[PDB]
């Protein structure tokens, strides 16, 4: 579409420049254009897609939380402005989540056969449904939570069959699914269980790793322990 006239390689190059320039909306737009070329993404390219959209939606989520807090405190009459503006940011956030979900559905997941790509995309699907769940309040909210859960569960089932317990994507998937359980599904015990099991199984596999792999895995393990420290 919009990036239709730019070469795939040039979109990827510009996405890397946009990251360096901290221009994450541009980065996301370039990576969307790259996906829409129709070819599968390499490991590095998947990471660029993910980083771009995590930064865009992360800023939107942070803004939404600031506005939602002000709106909660309001409820002297301030008028409709706080609600209206929270609604505007919410709608934008939903739109970005729907865009990422649409890239996953058209057609990244269905063409992803290797475990690493498929798990990566299914983790993304769980995450963007989780961000939709954070702002959901209407008839479809349970369905949004269930969609997040289903994506994360399929990713977990593949990861446990096909990846070692220290693989960083398997680890980050478990971490984010544990956050889902704690923050979204009102299942703190499931969150704690999953984080502990994940940590312990990773610990027991560190002996197999190179120095560099060890560093990658232990960094994520420390995020699991940080959540366990907060939760227990």
């Amino acid at each position: 579409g919009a990036m239709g006239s730019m070469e795939r390689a040039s979109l990827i190059q510009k996405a890397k420049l946009a990251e360096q320039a901290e221009r994450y909306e541009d980065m996301a737009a370039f990576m969307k254009g790259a996906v829409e070329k129709g070819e599968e993404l390499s490991c590095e390219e998947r990471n660029l897609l993910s980083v771009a959209y995590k930064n865009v939606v992360g800023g939107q989520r942070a803004a939404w939380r600031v506005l939602s807090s002000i709106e909660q405190k309001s409820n002297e009459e301030k008028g409709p402005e706080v609600r209206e503006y929270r609604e505007k940011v919410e709608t934008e956030l939903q739109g970005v989540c729907d865009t990422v979900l649409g890239l996953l559905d058209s057609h990244l997941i269905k063409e992803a056969g290797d475990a690493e790509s498929r798990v990566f995309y299914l983790k993304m699907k769980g995450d963007y449904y989780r961000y939709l769940a954070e702002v959901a309040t209407g008839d479809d909210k349970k369905r949004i939570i269930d969609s997040a859960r289903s994506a994360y569960q399929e990713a977990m089932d593949i990861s446990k069959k096909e990846m070692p317990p220290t693989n960083p994507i398997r680890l980050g998937l478990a971490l984010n699914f544990s956050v889902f359980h704690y923050e979204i599904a009102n299942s703190p015990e499931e969150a704690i269980s999953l984080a502990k099991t994940t940590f312990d199984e990773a610990m027991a596999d560190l002996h197999t790793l190179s120095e560099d792999s060890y560093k990658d895995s232990t960094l994520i393990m420390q995020l699991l322990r940080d959540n366990l420290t907060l939760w227990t």
Binding site: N47, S50, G172, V179, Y182
Partner: peptide, 9 residues
């Protein structure tokens, strides 16, 4: 608590 930041390539 914390999800993975995921904000740096």
């Amino acid at each position: 608590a914390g999800s993975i930041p995921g904000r740096r390539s």
